[PDB]
Amino acid sequence: EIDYKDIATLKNYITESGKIVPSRITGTRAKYQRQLARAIKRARYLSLLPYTDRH
């Protein structure tokens, strides 16, 4: 949600399809929603998380 290595906290904001979960279906503040996305993006590049569920 603020860090990328924390693959545990991020797996909460990711549907069973890889894509990140919207902010409206989590309440999560806007300011936070943005920061959270970045963690998931850079994390995907470090192969710590999947881009999608297919590969």
Partner: protein, 100 residues
């Protein structure tokens, strides 16, 4: 100096280099009045996707505080070292320590 949270993962069948790489980088940084504030050897680990082949990688952490120069001199070595694959280097945000 500017902090940099570097996390480089090496090829699995090269794990024996991991110790060498680290000892060198760390020294190189300090040699130039650097200042390491963290270090973690996550070693081997499953991969989300087969990045550059294989489904296993040897991760490593850093988070130093040296002048852009040296760290930049390093940004290249990671490229000219078949051993190391994907690499990344974030910014300062005030030296972090422990956890992760």
């Amino acid at each position: 100096m500017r902090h940099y949270e570097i996390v480089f993962m090496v090829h699995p069948d090269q794990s024996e280099q991991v110790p060498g790489m680290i000892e060198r980088y760390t020294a190189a940084i300090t040699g130039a009045e650097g200042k390491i504030h963290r270090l973690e050897d996550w070693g081997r680990r499953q991969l989300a996707y087969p990045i550059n082949k294989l489904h296993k990688a040897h991760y490593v952490l850093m988070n130093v505080e040296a002048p852009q120069e040296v760290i930049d001199e390093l940004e290249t070595t990671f490229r000219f070292n078949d051993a190391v694959i994907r690499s990344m280097v974030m910014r300062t945000k005030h030296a972090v320590t422990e956890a992760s």
